[PDB]
Amino acid sequence: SGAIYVGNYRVVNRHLATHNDWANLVWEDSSRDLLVSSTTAQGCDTIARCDCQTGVYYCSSRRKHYPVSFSKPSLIFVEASEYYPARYQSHLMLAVGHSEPGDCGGILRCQHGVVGIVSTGGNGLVGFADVRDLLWLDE
Ligand SMILES: COc1ncccc1NC(=O)N1CCC[C@H](C(N)=O)C1
Ligand SMILES: [Zn+2]
């Protein structure tokens, strides 16, 4: 679990969005595993606008943060799960690191701000849904 709170927006993994997220929907994209909902309170986070390929992510299944080197956002094949058929997920960044399904939502940050959230993993890989191209989150 986990979310990014920026301005009057909440960014979550689309497959973990709640009834309240869908009732206050701003934007969603199944190919990116992202959903953004509107909030009444002002959010605590800021979004990185950079080309960093290193950062630190929060891993809830270890109660720890780990440093990572990750690929540029790309179109990556993701195996079928209970949430989606087998498909290509876009804007995904992979790194070597630990994850379990419940780690989805953990934030990846660089020195500039939030880069994305944990969205996929397995066998010592972890994948992050990038949010740095979503410029409207800041307006
Ligand atoms: C962090 O996730 C994991 N980590 C380790 C083992 C397995 C997983 N799970 C996944 O990768 N899933 C399940 C949830 C929906 C994901 C998607 N973005 O399509 C795919
Ligand atoms: Zn950065």
The domains of the chain are located at 3-44, 45-139
Report the Cα–Cα distance between both ends of the chain, in Å, rounded: 25
CB atoms within 10 A of CB 20: 11
Is the minimum distance from the CB of 98 to ligand 1 under 6 angstroms?
Answer: no
- The tokens of 108 are what? 């990846």
Catalytic positions, please? 15, 33, 104
Whether 28 and 129 have beta carbons less than 8 Å apart is answered as: no
Indicate the annotated binding residues for Zn(2+): 50, 52, 110, 112
**Residue 4 Ramachandran class (φ > 0 left, ψ -120 to 50 alpha, else beta):** beta
- The tokens of 62 are what? 């270890």
Whether 115 and 109 have beta carbons less than 8 Å apart is answered as: yes
Atom 17 of ligand 1, nearest CA residue: 120
Is the minimum distance from the CB of 129 to ligand 1 under 6 angstroms?
Answer: no
Whether 131 and 49 have beta carbons less than 8 Å apart is answered as: no
Give the residue from 124, 126, 128, 138 showing the smallest Cα distance to 47.
138
d(CA 34, CA 20): 15
Per-residue DSSP letter, 136: G
d(CA 29, CA 35): 6
